[PDB]
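Consider the tokenized backbone below.
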């Protein structure tokens, strides 16, 4: 299924999607995506919308 990441960093902001079999797999692309762009913050997830949010 399609999972989405709401990114709210200091220098980078936006939204990205990915295809994953479950939430766990989607978190571990999205929580590499954060690392990739030097984004370190607090995380939330919404199973109903399959949406991750990372905020710096």
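A designed sequence for it:
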């Amino acid at each position: 299924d399609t999972y989405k990441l709401i990114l709210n960093g200091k220098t980078l902001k936006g939204e990205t999607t990915t295809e994953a079999v479950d939430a766990a797999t989607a978190e571990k692309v999205f929580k590499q995506y954060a690392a990739d762009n030097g984004v370190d913050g607090e995380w939330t997830y919404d199973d109903a919308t399959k949406t991750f949010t990372v905020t710096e």
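The chain has one domain: 1-56.
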